[PDB]
């Protein structure tokens, strides 16, 4: 019995080793294709535009709230500008 | 029994070793490809953007009530 | 009878000793792998950002409350900023 | 009876001693590894962090009512 | 009869004397193990933080009350800060 | 009769004595590991810390 | 009898000892592939980032 289970364990590790290399190869090439500094840009610039879209108004707001269930300021800030 | 159990233990540990080795190598080579300072500079953004966002409400004065 | 219970007590303490050593070995190696100053940092920096967020607004607030069952100021402070 | 009871007392105290010795050594070597000043400086944080939090509401004036 | 009651009374006092010494031994050794000025600190510092918290806000409050069922100022002071 | 109870008293007091020393020893040794100068200002850290720390330190 | 349990203790502790080292090795190596530096800054990024990053990094 046990030696057959060892022979499958060598195969299980072989499949894991080779597929992990195949994915890493694809991932490295995909991150030489797009210049990797612009991956910082691709993640930041969407949400950073939703900053530039409020900073252009230069608001001077006043807040009135309940105290134990108060207004979520993030849902406020997006809500002026479309959350969905 | 104790011979088979020692052998099953060695089998299980040998799997745990080799799959951990693969998962480290994968993690290492992907993190090498991006550069840890690029991961850092993404991670810094989330907080800093939320700061600029809430600052942009321009809250001069406030009132809290029951 | 009693000597078998003593022989089980020697075995029980042997188990308790050896497991406690395995746990301490793992714990010391973990706390040498991460820098211990960065373990101080990891616990503070999460709730520190929830300070740094409100500190950016520099609020100037007026509070109206009930007396016998008043407004919790911690639920107020997180509530502007997402409690859940 | 009193011989067996003295022997059972001796057995129990011998267990209590040895499990306490293990639990001290465990506590000692973990607290050695973190450093008492690291435990201190985490414990100091909770209060000071809550102070900075509530200070940041900037409460100028207040009103209590029935 | 009554001689047996005297003999039990000696035994009752013997138990009371010994258990009282055993507890006092533990109590003295405990209060040498942790420094007794730290036992002064331990009881004060919990409530001290619930002072140091409100003292940081430096409130300038106004009160309105019913006269015959007035607002408890301790439940007010904790209530801003979590009573439960 | 009463000699048995007078002997059971020695046994009960022996159990009280020998367990009290184990707990005192444990308390002194834990206190000497986390020295009193950092048991002070651990009491203020509040429940969420105290639970997290006692889970963290076995 | 009890010799079998005295042997089972060696086996259970051997399993504890050998698995503990594999997880430490993995943790030390991942915590060197990225430093302890850059786990700071990652700790504040919040859940939407941390989930996205652990998906993004294999």
Short mmCIF file of C-alpha atoms in Angstrom, two decimals:
data_model
loop_
_atom_site.label_atom_id
_atom_site.label_comp_id
_atom_site.label_asym_id
_atom_site.label_seq_id
_atom_site.Cartn_x
_atom_site.Cartn_y
_atom_site.Cartn_z
CA UNK A 1 0.00 0.00 0.00
CA UNK A 2 2.15 2.89 1.34
CA UNK A 3 4.61 3.01 -1.61
CA UNK A 4 1.73 3.67 -4.06
CA UNK A 5 0.64 6.59 -1.86
CA UNK A 6 4.29 7.91 -1.96
CA UNK A 7 4.26 7.51 -5.76
CA UNK A 8 1.07 9.64 -5.96
CA UNK A 9 2.66 12.21 -3.57
CA UNK A 10 5.59 12.67 -6.00
CA UNK A 11 3.02 13.23 -8.79
CA UNK A 12 0.93 15.67 -6.66
CA UNK A 13 4.04 17.74 -5.87
CA UNK A 14 5.11 17.54 -9.56
CA UNK A 15 1.74 18.97 -10.71
CA UNK A 16 1.94 21.69 -8.04
CA UNK A 17 5.55 22.62 -9.00
CA UNK A 18 4.91 22.80 -12.75
CA UNK A 19 1.59 24.68 -12.63
CA UNK A 20 3.05 27.20 -10.14
CA UNK A 21 5.95 27.85 -12.56
CA UNK A 22 3.52 28.23 -15.50
CA UNK A 23 1.46 30.81 -13.58
CA UNK A 24 4.60 32.68 -12.37
CA UNK A 25 5.93 32.76 -15.97
CA UNK A 26 2.61 34.28 -17.17
CA UNK A 27 2.51 36.75 -14.23
CA UNK A 28 6.11 37.98 -14.77
CA UNK A 29 5.52 38.48 -18.52
CA UNK A 30 2.19 40.30 -17.78
CA UNK A 31 4.15 42.67 -15.42
CA UNK A 32 6.90 43.35 -17.97
CA UNK A 33 4.16 44.03 -20.60
CA UNK A 34 2.43 46.83 -18.69
CA UNK A 35 5.26 48.97 -17.21
CA UNK A 36 4.92 48.14 -13.46
CA UNK A 37 4.90 51.77 -12.19
CA UNK A 38 1.67 52.23 -14.23
CA UNK A 39 0.08 49.34 -12.21
CA UNK A 40 0.32 51.81 -9.27
CA UNK A 41 -1.47 54.33 -11.51
CA UNK A 42 -4.18 51.80 -12.61
CA UNK A 43 -5.14 51.06 -8.97
CA UNK A 44 -4.88 54.67 -7.65
CA UNK A 45 -6.17 56.87 -10.48
CA UNK A 46 -9.84 55.65 -10.38
CA UNK A 47 -10.37 56.47 -6.67
CA UNK A 48 -8.02 59.52 -7.00
CA UNK A 49 -10.38 60.96 -9.64
CA UNK A 50 -13.17 60.81 -7.03
CA UNK A 51 -10.86 63.07 -4.95
CA UNK A 52 -10.23 65.53 -7.82
CA UNK A 53 -14.01 65.62 -8.47
CA UNK A 54 -14.64 66.99 -4.91
CA UNK A 55 -11.45 69.09 -4.49
CA UNK A 56 -12.64 71.15 -7.48
CA UNK A 57 -15.80 72.24 -5.55
CA UNK A 58 -13.75 73.40 -2.50
CA UNK A 59 -16.75 72.91 -0.17
CA UNK A 60 -17.39 74.79 3.12
CA UNK A 61 -19.92 72.43 4.70
CA UNK A 62 -21.69 72.31 8.11
CA UNK A 63 -22.75 69.05 9.77
CA UNK A 64 -25.86 68.34 11.88
CA UNK A 65 -26.16 64.71 13.17
CA UNK A 66 -27.71 62.31 15.62
CA UNK A 67 -25.00 61.09 18.06
CA UNK A 68 -25.53 57.31 18.45
CA UNK A 69 -26.34 56.54 14.76
CA UNK A 70 -24.39 59.41 13.09
CA UNK A 71 -24.01 60.10 9.34
CA UNK A 72 -21.29 58.07 7.60
CA UNK A 73 -19.03 60.71 6.01
CA UNK A 74 -17.77 58.30 3.29
CA UNK A 75 -21.32 57.48 2.14
CA UNK A 76 -21.88 61.25 2.19
CA UNK A 77 -18.80 62.06 0.13
CA UNK A 78 -19.47 59.38 -2.53
CA UNK A 79 -23.26 59.96 -2.36
CA UNK A 80 -22.96 63.48 -3.81
CA UNK A 81 -21.13 61.87 -6.74
CA UNK A 82 -22.81 58.43 -7.22
CA UNK A 83 -22.04 55.45 -4.99
CA UNK A 84 -23.63 52.71 -7.25
CA UNK B 1 0.97 -0.06 14.00
CA UNK B 2 3.75 2.30 15.31
CA UNK B 3 5.89 1.49 12.19
CA UNK B 4 3.00 2.31 9.81
CA UNK B 5 2.12 5.42 11.83
CA UNK B 6 5.77 6.65 11.72
CA UNK B 7 5.70 6.05 7.97
CA UNK B 8 2.34 7.89 7.53
CA UNK B 9 3.78 10.75 9.62
CA UNK B 10 6.82 10.96 7.31
CA UNK B 11 4.57 10.86 4.23
CA UNK B 12 2.35 13.70 5.61
CA UNK B 13 5.29 15.91 6.68
CA UNK B 14 6.95 15.38 3.27
CA UNK B 15 3.75 16.67 1.57
CA UNK B 16 3.51 19.65 3.94
CA UNK B 17 7.18 20.56 3.27
CA UNK B 18 6.99 20.35 -0.53
CA UNK B 19 3.66 22.20 -0.99
CA UNK B 20 4.93 24.96 1.35
CA UNK B 21 8.14 25.18 -0.75
CA UNK B 22 6.05 25.64 -3.93
CA UNK B 23 3.80 28.29 -2.32
CA UNK B 24 6.83 30.27 -1.06
CA UNK B 25 8.56 30.17 -4.48
CA UNK B 26 5.31 31.35 -6.13
CA UNK B 27 4.85 34.18 -3.58
CA UNK B 28 8.55 35.15 -3.81
CA UNK B 29 8.68 35.36 -7.62
CA UNK B 30 5.40 37.30 -7.95
CA UNK B 31 6.45 39.79 -5.21
CA UNK B 32 9.88 40.09 -6.93
CA UNK B 33 8.09 40.97 -10.21
CA UNK B 34 6.10 43.87 -8.71
CA UNK B 35 8.78 45.09 -6.27
CA UNK B 36 7.92 45.40 -2.52
CA UNK B 37 8.05 49.24 -2.76
CA UNK B 38 5.24 49.08 -5.38
CA UNK B 39 3.16 46.98 -2.90
CA UNK B 40 4.04 49.56 -0.19
CA UNK B 41 3.04 52.50 -2.40
CA UNK B 42 -0.34 50.86 -3.23
CA UNK B 43 -0.91 50.14 0.49
CA UNK B 44 -0.18 53.80 1.49
CA UNK B 45 -2.73 55.10 -1.05
CA UNK B 46 -5.96 53.71 0.57
CA UNK B 47 -5.52 55.75 3.80
CA UNK B 48 -4.17 58.90 2.07
CA UNK B 49 -7.04 59.00 -0.44
CA UNK B 50 -9.62 58.60 2.35
CA UNK B 51 -7.88 61.51 4.11
CA UNK B 52 -8.08 63.77 1.00
CA UNK B 53 -11.69 62.66 0.40
CA UNK B 54 -12.96 63.58 3.88
CA UNK B 55 -10.85 66.77 3.92
CA UNK B 56 -12.71 67.77 0.71
CA UNK B 57 -16.03 68.04 2.59
CA UNK B 58 -14.51 71.25 4.12
CA UNK B 59 -16.31 70.78 7.49
CA UNK B 60 -16.11 74.21 9.21
CA UNK B 61 -18.45 73.56 12.17
CA UNK B 62 -20.75 70.78 13.44
CA UNK B 63 -23.67 69.97 15.76
CA UNK B 64 -24.49 66.69 17.50
CA UNK B 65 -27.94 65.94 19.01
CA UNK B 66 -29.90 63.12 20.72
CA UNK C 1 -3.52 0.93 41.58
CA UNK C 2 -1.78 4.17 42.68
CA UNK C 3 1.57 3.48 40.92
CA UNK C 4 -0.20 3.27 37.51
CA UNK C 5 -1.78 6.67 38.22
CA UNK C 6 1.77 7.98 39.07
CA UNK C 7 3.07 6.47 35.82
CA UNK C 8 0.24 8.28 33.95
CA UNK C 9 1.16 11.51 35.83
CA UNK C 10 4.79 11.26 34.63
CA UNK C 11 3.46 10.77 31.06
CA UNK C 12 1.01 13.72 31.42
CA UNK C 13 3.77 16.08 32.59
CA UNK C 14 6.03 14.76 29.78
CA UNK C 15 3.30 15.69 27.24
CA UNK C 16 2.68 19.08 28.88
CA UNK C 17 6.44 19.88 28.92
CA UNK C 18 7.16 18.81 25.32
CA UNK C 19 4.13 20.58 23.82
CA UNK C 20 4.91 23.80 25.72
CA UNK C 21 8.48 23.68 24.31
CA UNK C 22 7.18 23.20 20.73
CA UNK C 23 4.82 26.16 21.15
CA UNK C 24 7.54 28.42 22.67
CA UNK C 25 10.01 27.40 19.91
CA UNK C 26 7.43 28.36 17.23
CA UNK C 27 6.51 31.59 19.08
CA UNK C 28 10.15 32.74 19.52
CA UNK C 29 11.02 31.98 15.88
CA UNK C 30 7.86 33.86 14.72
CA UNK C 31 8.80 36.87 16.93
CA UNK C 32 12.34 36.86 15.45
CA UNK C 33 10.95 36.59 11.87
CA UNK C 34 8.74 39.69 12.16
CA UNK C 35 10.66 42.53 13.90
CA UNK C 36 9.17 42.94 17.44
CA UNK C 37 8.92 46.75 16.93
CA UNK C 38 6.77 46.00 13.83
CA UNK C 39 4.59 43.79 16.14
CA UNK C 40 4.09 46.95 18.29
CA UNK C 41 3.33 48.82 15.04
CA UNK C 42 0.81 46.22 13.73
CA UNK C 43 -1.50 46.58 16.74
CA UNK C 44 -1.36 50.42 16.93
CA UNK C 45 -1.38 51.45 13.26
CA UNK C 46 -4.93 50.14 12.44
CA UNK C 47 -6.76 52.15 15.17
CA UNK C 48 -4.15 54.95 14.70
CA UNK C 49 -5.45 55.57 11.18
CA UNK C 50 -8.96 56.01 12.64
CA UNK C 51 -7.40 58.79 14.76
CA UNK C 52 -5.46 60.34 11.85
CA UNK C 53 -8.69 60.43 9.79
CA UNK C 54 -10.70 62.49 12.32
CA UNK C 55 -7.60 64.60 13.10
CA UNK C 56 -7.53 65.73 9.45
CA UNK C 57 -10.99 67.36 9.80
CA UNK C 58 -10.01 69.42 12.90
CA UNK C 59 -13.69 69.55 13.93
CA UNK C 60 -15.34 72.28 16.04
CA UNK C 61 -18.53 70.76 17.47
CA UNK C 62 -21.54 71.56 19.68
CA UNK C 63 -23.11 68.71 21.70
CA UNK C 64 -26.80 68.55 22.77
CA UNK C 65 -27.76 65.46 24.87
CA UNK C 66 -30.20 63.71 27.12
CA UNK C 67 -28.99 63.40 30.76
CA UNK C 68 -29.88 59.96 32.13
CA UNK C 69 -29.10 58.04 28.84
CA UNK C 70 -26.66 60.35 26.91
CA UNK C 71 -24.78 60.03 23.55
CA UNK C 72 -21.73 57.74 23.57
CA UNK C 73 -18.82 59.78 22.20
CA UNK C 74 -16.90 56.69 20.95
CA UNK C 75 -19.88 55.50 18.88
CA UNK C 76 -20.15 59.12 17.68
CA UNK C 77 -16.49 59.27 16.66
CA UNK C 78 -16.38 55.90 14.83
CA UNK C 79 -19.93 56.47 13.50
CA UNK C 80 -18.87 59.35 11.26
CA UNK C 81 -16.23 56.98 9.86
CA UNK C 82 -17.92 53.52 9.72
CA UNK C 83 -18.24 51.42 12.89
CA UNK C 84 -19.09 48.05 11.13
CA UNK D 1 -7.59 5.13 54.55
CA UNK D 2 -5.28 7.88 55.99
CA UNK D 3 -2.25 6.24 54.24
CA UNK D 4 -4.05 6.18 50.85
CA UNK D 5 -5.35 9.72 51.41
CA UNK D 6 -1.81 11.00 52.24
CA UNK D 7 -0.61 9.26 49.08
CA UNK D 8 -3.42 10.81 46.94
CA UNK D 9 -2.62 14.24 48.43
CA UNK D 10 1.05 13.73 47.49
CA UNK D 11 0.06 12.68 43.94
CA UNK D 12 -2.22 15.75 43.48
CA UNK D 13 0.33 18.26 44.85
CA UNK D 14 3.01 16.70 42.60
CA UNK D 15 0.71 17.30 39.56
CA UNK D 16 -0.12 20.86 40.63
CA UNK D 17 3.59 21.71 41.11
CA UNK D 18 4.66 20.33 37.72
CA UNK D 19 1.83 21.83 35.60
CA UNK D 20 2.46 25.22 37.29
CA UNK D 21 6.20 24.87 36.44
CA UNK D 22 5.30 24.30 32.74
CA UNK D 23 2.87 27.24 32.66
CA UNK D 24 5.43 29.61 34.25
CA UNK D 25 8.23 28.55 31.85
CA UNK D 26 5.84 29.04 28.89
CA UNK D 27 4.73 32.50 30.12
CA UNK D 28 8.35 33.47 30.92
CA UNK D 29 9.85 32.51 27.56
CA UNK D 30 7.06 34.18 25.54
CA UNK D 31 7.26 37.42 27.62
CA UNK D 32 11.10 37.27 27.29
CA UNK D 33 10.68 37.08 23.49
CA UNK D 34 8.27 40.06 23.13
CA UNK D 35 10.01 42.20 25.77
CA UNK D 36 8.19 43.75 28.81
CA UNK D 37 8.58 47.27 27.30
CA UNK D 38 6.74 46.04 24.15
CA UNK D 39 3.85 44.82 26.36
CA UNK D 40 3.99 48.19 28.21
CA UNK D 41 3.99 50.31 25.06
CA UNK D 42 1.04 48.33 23.58
CA UNK D 43 -0.84 48.66 26.92
CA UNK D 44 -0.20 52.46 27.06
CA UNK D 45 -1.66 52.79 23.53
CA UNK D 46 -5.36 51.95 24.31
CA UNK D 47 -5.88 54.98 26.63
CA UNK D 48 -3.76 57.48 24.61
CA UNK D 49 -5.44 56.45 21.34
CA UNK D 50 -8.90 56.92 22.90
CA UNK D 51 -7.76 60.32 24.25
CA UNK D 52 -6.66 61.48 20.75
CA UNK D 53 -9.89 60.09 19.27
CA UNK D 54 -12.23 61.99 21.61
CA UNK D 55 -10.07 65.14 21.52
CA UNK D 56 -10.60 65.14 17.72
CA UNK D 57 -14.35 65.80 18.08
CA UNK D 58 -13.29 69.37 19.11
CA UNK D 59 -16.23 69.90 21.51
CA UNK D 60 -16.39 73.69 22.12
CA UNK D 61 -19.68 73.87 24.06
CA UNK D 62 -22.38 71.43 25.23
CA UNK D 63 -25.94 71.24 26.59
CA UNK D 64 -27.53 68.62 28.84
CA UNK D 65 -31.37 68.34 29.00
CA UNK D 66 -34.15 66.12 30.46
CA UNK E 1 -21.28 14.16 77.51
CA UNK E 2 -19.92 17.74 77.86
CA UNK E 3 -16.23 16.58 77.79
CA UNK E 4 -16.78 15.46 74.15
CA UNK E 5 -18.16 18.91 73.30
CA UNK E 6 -14.98 20.45 74.87
CA UNK E 7 -12.86 18.03 72.81
CA UNK E 8 -14.65 19.10 69.57
CA UNK E 9 -14.31 22.79 70.56
CA UNK E 10 -10.51 22.41 70.86
CA UNK E 11 -10.50 20.80 67.38
CA UNK E 12 -12.72 23.57 65.88
CA UNK E 13 -10.39 26.29 67.22
CA UNK E 14 -7.38 24.25 65.99
CA UNK E 15 -8.83 24.24 62.44
CA UNK E 16 -9.73 27.94 62.67
CA UNK E 17 -6.20 28.87 63.90
CA UNK E 18 -4.37 26.87 61.23
CA UNK E 19 -6.50 27.89 58.23
CA UNK E 20 -6.23 31.56 59.27
CA UNK E 21 -2.40 31.28 59.39
CA UNK E 22 -2.34 29.51 55.98
CA UNK E 23 -4.42 32.28 54.39
CA UNK E 24 -2.35 35.08 56.04
CA UNK E 25 0.87 33.41 54.77
CA UNK E 26 -0.56 33.44 51.20
CA UNK E 27 -1.82 37.04 51.62
CA UNK E 28 1.52 38.42 52.94
CA UNK E 29 3.54 36.56 50.29
CA UNK E 30 1.17 37.85 47.54
CA UNK E 31 1.64 41.43 48.88
CA UNK E 32 5.44 40.98 48.81
CA UNK E 33 5.30 39.46 45.27
CA UNK E 34 3.65 42.57 43.78
CA UNK E 35 4.83 45.85 45.38
CA UNK E 36 2.05 47.35 47.60
CA UNK E 37 2.35 50.82 45.96
CA UNK E 38 1.38 49.02 42.70
CA UNK E 39 -1.69 47.68 44.65
CA UNK E 40 -2.53 51.37 45.40
CA UNK E 41 -2.05 52.12 41.68
CA UNK E 42 -4.17 49.14 40.46
CA UNK E 43 -7.36 50.23 42.26
CA UNK E 44 -7.00 53.97 41.36
CA UNK E 45 -5.76 53.84 37.76
CA UNK E 46 -8.88 52.19 36.21
CA UNK E 47 -11.19 55.02 37.41
CA UNK E 48 -8.29 57.50 36.85
CA UNK E 49 -8.46 56.87 33.12
CA UNK E 50 -12.21 57.61 33.13
CA UNK E 51 -11.18 60.97 34.69
CA UNK E 52 -8.22 61.64 32.34
CA UNK E 53 -10.52 60.99 29.36
CA UNK E 54 -13.15 63.65 30.26
CA UNK E 55 -10.43 66.06 31.49
CA UNK E 56 -8.95 66.03 27.96
CA UNK E 57 -12.17 67.46 26.43
CA UNK E 58 -12.30 70.42 28.89
CA UNK E 59 -16.09 70.75 28.46
CA UNK E 60 -18.02 74.01 29.00
CA UNK E 61 -21.47 72.51 29.54
CA UNK E 62 -24.91 73.96 30.36
CA UNK E 63 -27.56 72.01 32.29
CA UNK E 64 -31.37 71.94 32.05
CA UNK E 65 -33.28 69.65 34.49
CA UNK E 66 -36.57 68.75 36.01
CA UNK E 67 -36.30 69.69 39.71
CA UNK E 68 -37.82 66.71 41.54
CA UNK E 69 -36.37 63.90 39.32
CA UNK E 70 -33.13 65.63 38.19
CA UNK E 71 -30.41 64.27 35.89
CA UNK E 72 -27.79 62.16 37.69
CA UNK E 73 -24.44 63.83 36.91
CA UNK E 74 -22.44 60.58 37.40
CA UNK E 75 -24.59 58.68 34.86
CA UNK E 76 -24.07 61.74 32.63
CA UNK E 77 -20.29 61.69 33.06
CA UNK E 78 -19.90 57.94 32.43
CA UNK E 79 -22.68 57.94 29.81
CA UNK E 80 -20.67 60.06 27.36
CA UNK E 81 -17.91 57.47 27.74
CA UNK E 82 -19.67 54.07 28.07
CA UNK E 83 -21.25 53.04 31.38
CA UNK E 84 -21.70 49.27 30.52
CA UNK F 1 -13.46 8.16 67.16
CA UNK F 2 -12.23 11.81 67.39
CA UNK F 3 -8.56 10.86 66.65
CA UNK F 4 -9.62 10.17 63.03
CA UNK F 5 -11.03 13.73 62.71
CA UNK F 6 -7.92 15.15 64.49
CA UNK F 7 -5.90 13.28 61.81
CA UNK F 8 -8.20 14.47 58.96
CA UNK F 9 -7.49 18.02 60.16
CA UNK F 10 -3.73 17.49 59.63
CA UNK F 11 -4.55 16.19 56.12
CA UNK F 12 -6.91 19.12 55.23
CA UNK F 13 -4.41 21.70 56.57
CA UNK F 14 -1.58 19.90 54.70
CA UNK F 15 -3.59 20.22 51.46
CA UNK F 16 -4.32 23.90 52.20
CA UNK F 17 -0.60 24.55 52.97
CA UNK F 18 0.89 22.76 49.95
CA UNK F 19 -1.51 24.24 47.35
CA UNK F 20 -1.07 27.78 48.75
CA UNK F 21 2.72 27.57 48.18
CA UNK F 22 2.27 26.46 44.51
CA UNK F 23 0.00 29.41 43.70
CA UNK F 24 2.26 31.93 45.54
CA UNK F 25 5.33 30.57 43.69
CA UNK F 26 3.47 30.86 40.34
CA UNK F 27 2.28 34.41 41.11
CA UNK F 28 5.76 35.56 42.25
CA UNK F 29 7.41 34.00 39.19
CA UNK F 30 4.89 35.45 36.69
CA UNK F 31 5.19 38.85 38.46
CA UNK F 32 9.02 38.63 38.28
CA UNK F 33 8.77 37.87 34.51
CA UNK F 34 6.35 40.79 33.78
CA UNK F 35 7.94 43.09 36.42
CA UNK F 36 5.50 45.29 38.52
CA UNK F 37 6.59 48.50 36.66
CA UNK F 38 4.58 47.08 33.67
CA UNK F 39 1.66 45.57 35.63
CA UNK F 40 0.95 49.19 36.55
CA UNK F 41 -0.44 50.71 33.32
CA UNK F 42 -1.56 47.24 32.08
CA UNK F 43 -4.74 47.69 34.23
CA UNK F 44 -5.78 50.83 32.22
CA UNK F 45 -5.42 49.05 28.81
CA UNK F 46 -9.06 47.86 29.03
CA UNK F 47 -10.72 44.50 28.39
CA UNK F 48 -10.07 44.16 24.61
CA UNK F 49 -6.30 44.42 25.29
CA UNK F 50 -6.26 42.29 28.47
CA UNK F 51 -8.03 39.37 26.68
CA UNK F 52 -5.78 39.74 23.56
CA UNK F 53 -2.61 39.81 25.74
CA UNK F 54 -3.56 36.76 27.87
CA UNK F 55 -4.39 34.89 24.61
CA UNK F 56 -1.03 36.13 23.15
CA UNK F 57 1.08 35.00 26.17
CA UNK F 58 -0.30 31.44 26.73
CA UNK G 1 0.04 -1.31 27.98
CA UNK G 2 1.46 2.12 29.03
CA UNK G 3 4.58 1.71 26.80
CA UNK G 4 2.28 2.06 23.76
CA UNK G 5 1.01 5.44 25.06
CA UNK G 6 4.63 6.43 25.94
CA UNK G 7 5.43 5.68 22.26
CA UNK G 8 2.28 7.52 21.03
CA UNK G 9 3.51 10.56 22.96
CA UNK G 10 6.80 10.51 20.96
CA UNK G 11 4.72 10.22 17.76
CA UNK G 12 2.32 13.10 18.65
CA UNK G 13 5.24 15.34 19.74
CA UNK G 14 7.21 14.36 16.58
CA UNK G 15 4.22 15.47 14.47
CA UNK G 16 3.95 18.70 16.47
CA UNK G 17 7.75 19.33 16.13
CA UNK G 18 7.97 18.70 12.37
CA UNK G 19 4.84 20.69 11.37
CA UNK G 20 5.87 23.65 13.58
CA UNK G 21 9.17 24.05 11.67
CA UNK G 22 7.46 24.00 8.22
CA UNK G 23 5.12 26.85 9.18
CA UNK G 24 7.98 28.88 10.77
CA UNK G 25 10.13 28.36 7.63
CA UNK G 26 7.21 29.49 5.40
CA UNK G 27 6.49 32.52 7.60
CA UNK G 28 10.18 33.58 7.83
CA UNK G 29 10.61 33.18 4.07
CA UNK G 30 7.43 35.11 3.12
CA UNK G 31 8.45 37.74 5.77
CA UNK G 32 11.77 38.07 3.85
CA UNK G 33 10.33 37.97 0.28
CA UNK G 34 8.61 41.11 1.57
CA UNK G 35 10.21 42.62 4.72
CA UNK G 36 8.77 43.43 8.17
CA UNK G 37 8.98 46.89 6.62
CA UNK G 38 6.17 46.92 3.96
CA UNK G 39 4.03 44.79 6.33
CA UNK G 40 3.84 48.12 8.11
CA UNK G 41 1.99 50.25 5.51
CA UNK G 42 0.14 46.99 4.46
CA UNK G 43 -1.46 46.70 7.96
CA UNK G 44 -3.27 50.11 7.55
CA UNK G 45 -4.49 49.53 3.94
CA UNK G 46 -7.76 47.94 5.16
CA UNK G 47 -9.78 44.98 3.95
CA UNK G 48 -10.55 45.86 0.30
CA UNK G 49 -6.77 46.22 -0.32
CA UNK G 50 -5.66 43.23 1.81
CA UNK G 51 -8.12 40.83 0.05
CA UNK G 52 -7.17 42.28 -3.39
CA UNK G 53 -3.41 41.96 -2.62
CA UNK G 54 -3.62 38.36 -1.29
CA UNK G 55 -5.56 37.50 -4.50
CA UNK G 56 -3.00 39.52 -6.60
CA UNK G 57 0.11 37.84 -5.06
CA UNK G 58 -0.65 34.10 -5.53
#
